[PDB]
Paper text:
We measured the aggregation temperature (Tagg) for each nanoparticle by monitoring DLS while heating from 25 to 84 °C, which showed that all nanoparticles retained their intended assembly state until at least 60 °C, and I3-[name] did not aggregate in the measured range. Icosahedral 3D reconstructions at 2.5 Å, 2.3 Å, and 3.5 Å resolution were obtained for I3-A6, I3-[name], and I3-A7, respectively, allowing us to build atomic models of each nanoparticle. Comparing the experimental cryo-EM structures to the computational design models demonstrated that AF2 structure prediction was quite accurate: The all-atom rmsd for a single monomer of I3-A6, I3-[name], and I3-A7 were 1.3 Å, 1.7 Å, and 1.4 Å, respectively. Aligning two subunits across the designed interfaces revealed that these were designed with high accuracy, yielding alpha-carbon rmsds of 0.7 Å, 1.1 Å, and 1.5 Å, respectively. In each case, the rotameric states of the interdigitated hydrophobic side chains at the designed interfaces corresponded well with the design models, as did the polar residues lining the periphery of the I3-A6 and I3-[name] interfaces. Slight rigid body deviations between the building blocks added up to alpha-carbon rmsds of 1.6 Å, 2.2 Å, and 2.2 Å across the entire 60-subunit nanoparticle for I3-A6, I3-[name], and I3-A7, respectively. These values are comparable to those obtained from previous computational nanoparticle design campaigns that started from high-resolution crystal structures of the building blocks.
Here, we develop a general method for designing self-assembling proteins that uses predicted structures of oligomeric proteins from thermophilic organisms as building blocks. Of the 359 identified thermophilic trimer homologs, 191 yielded high-confidence AF2 predictions [predicted aligned error (pAE) < 5, predicted local distance difference test (pLDDT) > 90]. We docked these predicted structures in the so-called “I3” architecture by aligning their threefold symmetry axes to the corresponding axes of icosahedral point group symmetry, using the Rosetta SymDofMover to sample the translational and rotational degrees of freedom along this shared axis [Fig. 1C, (27)]. To evaluate the accuracy of our design method at high resolution, we used single-particle cryoelectron microscopy (cryo-EM) to determine the structures of one nanoparticle from each of the successful PDB seeds.
Residue numbers in the entry:
A (entry chain 9), B (entry chain 6), C (entry chain w), D (entry chain 4): 1 to 136, 144 to 169, 177 to 251
The structure:
């Protein structure tokens, strides 16, 4: 039961992906009692999991699994291990630690479409859910090509690196409408670390939009924005 | 200790791959007491493992594992599951049954070089040892391209479909010499189901040659051929 | 439960008759755990049952009965006993040993149509299932006469001696089509000891065709051929 | 043992000084399990220790001491006590609380070079490790004079107030090269509260550079930047 339960009206809620930079284990155990209902995925940011103690990483993953959250290591660590030639050992250690998903990217390295598809099948047949990063010359048509290529290669979701906002910070609605006409947006996730970006995507697509790089203390804020309980979206959703 | 141990002279022994068509479980348990020292891999032929009871398949794999043998399902079962779109569930069931390797082939299907490389990484990152089948227009140079492509993609061994023998059954020694000049033959395995083929490869490359499709009752015959203890190779090795 | 159970598609399976030349008792007990689901009848070949120890013959028959298989002695032993004038003692000993069927033939003897029908009723009223052998001058029309005569006399199945293949080894499809127009092929069984014959009948009549003289180690091979899990019938059935 | 231990390559790591604004005691106890291996010193910021309960300050200092971290009160509290004439009582209370170092500064007060040297000896002979703050007219040569004066007076480290970055945010590399030619940079520490400054110093001097005013939640980020595990320093270190 929520406080003020009589104010609840039911709605379609999109995915939330949370960025964890290194939260303490028993802080995570208590933090999920407030907002574990509103998180779908957690990214351990970039290579941060390769810095932390191995029993601390396992203990944190068990706390997220008790709420049904899927945890994964950021794609920079895959690109690191891939550049060292260690990609099979990276995939094996992910399974021993207990991640349920992996992210494929070429943000710090160059990887061909042949190697990218091979890496996607590599991760699926190893038993992970697969996410990919798109956005790195790229017109909106070139993003549409890469998104469709990753979905046809078998990625479960595509993350748009965040492009979609102009020099002032207003959303480029023509490109965003062209994207929605050419791609199944139910399989797309947008990076929206700033509250103004979260408002712009919610006002464009409604409460069902999928969002990523959400800061751990803004999870409750985002749920109030989806539900119309903050002055930015009050009476608009 | 072997009978007549004083006749033993030590030598470099190549790989043996045995073909199992459906041997009974407690027949396999007793059979390995005679010749388990001389087997490296067992192929469960084509789709035969998809016909047998699941507890019988597990029981057989445990008997081969007690002698350190690596068991795998033949490449036609991969092509079947791949043609149905079930390739990830095929890899998952292989792990649950306890196979330690898989074979990638296109003997009945058509698969591109791009899909073939993606399937090889698929199997490697899932933690299997990977074998591939080559031979299906192909000159000796086209075999050499395909062998090097599968080895560069990361196959642990390449099996040559058996081409290498003429219309009478004599070995095409010029093509076989061109192969040995362009490929690391320590990673190549030759199909040799007939005793005359086993003799031709042993006389060309010595006891260290790797051989496949060996019938279960010819394993002891092959060890006598490698060791010079049968009239075909007597005094020639 | 079969291994890879998710690949199973349900189909109409025809009869399999297996030839036993003298398999050991506890080999049979273990062998049926692999392939007893895919056998309908076992022929003890020619006169081999008259050579073996009487308690060994009973012990083998009980192992086949535990899987619901019907065992019978080959028709050359009936022709032997009939030529000695001992046919009633042969029928009595079959019941004491525990065979559930008998085969009537004239492959080495000469027997009139009158005596043939009298022998068919002889075996039915004694309580056996009756099979007959046809093929010994005979055009396809003369086979069609003999098949209908044996079915009208009351035989449960007619076995075609295997005629149906040319001098190269290709099936004589014109005669085989004329047969299917004149005879109920659900009561016909074809001899097919070679894998090329098994493929030719499966491609002509589908998975539901009835086959005989199957070697004991080829039963799993035949089930993969019926199910399309081997390169000869892959994607054709 | 770290997660992904096989990716570790050994390297020279510089000092990290962390700013604590008032973290809760049992939050600090859990937080050090994640990143206590990557902290050398903790500054209790400005006068914040004089606002907190005396048993809470002791409890926090004991949690930092269990990881070998040296805690100190920020130099504004020394300047406060010095301006009141109470500097000897401030030194006495620091020993009773259990700080292991002190910071000498004139950031808000005016103090002569005579009084500054007397304060450095005051703190050393009382048994503390001594840090000083430099930067307040000053050319890079005048910074060099003050750094050498504090090191000759006996300071264990000198902190550069953070000058070294231009009006756009780019590092003034000409002055930074002149500094490194005149001063032992192993005894210098740079203030770098922003990630762009931390990157600029790591790219100029390598992973061995000493950094200060690191936010408590950015300690794991900084260790990934030193180790090349984040896109800013990926492949550059």
């Amino acid at each position: 039961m929520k406080a003020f339960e009589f104010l609840y009206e039911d709605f379609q809620r999109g995915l939330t992906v949370v960025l964890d930079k290194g939260l303490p284990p028993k802080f995570v155990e208590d933090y999920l009692k407030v907002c574990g209902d509103y998180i779908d995925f957690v990214k351990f940011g970039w290579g941060t999991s390769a810095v932390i103690d191995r029993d601390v990483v396992k203990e944190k993953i068990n706390y997220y699994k008790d709420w049904g959250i899927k945890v994964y290591p950021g794609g920079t660590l895959f690109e690191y291990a891939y550049s060292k030639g260690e990609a099979a050992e990276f995939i094996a250690e992910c399974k021993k630690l207990g991640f349920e998903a992996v992210e494929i990217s070429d943000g710090s390295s160059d990887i061909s479409l042949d190697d990218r598809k091979a890496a996607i099948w590599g991760a699926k047949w190893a038993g992970f859910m697969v996410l990919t990063e798109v956005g790195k010359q790229l017109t909106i048509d070139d993003r549409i090509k890469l998104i469709n290529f990753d979905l046809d290669a078998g990625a479960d979701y595509v993350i748009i690196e965040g492009g979609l906002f102009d020099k002032e910070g207003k959303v480029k609605e023509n490109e965003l409408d062209v994207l929605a006409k050419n791609v199944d947006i139910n399989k797309v996730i947008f990076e929206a670390p700033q509250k103004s970006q979260q408002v712009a995507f919610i006002l464009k697509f409604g409460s069902s939009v999928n969002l990523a790089n959400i800061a751990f203390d803004e999870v409750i804020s985002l749920e109030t924005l989806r539900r119309g309980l903050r002055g930015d979206t009050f009476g608009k959703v």
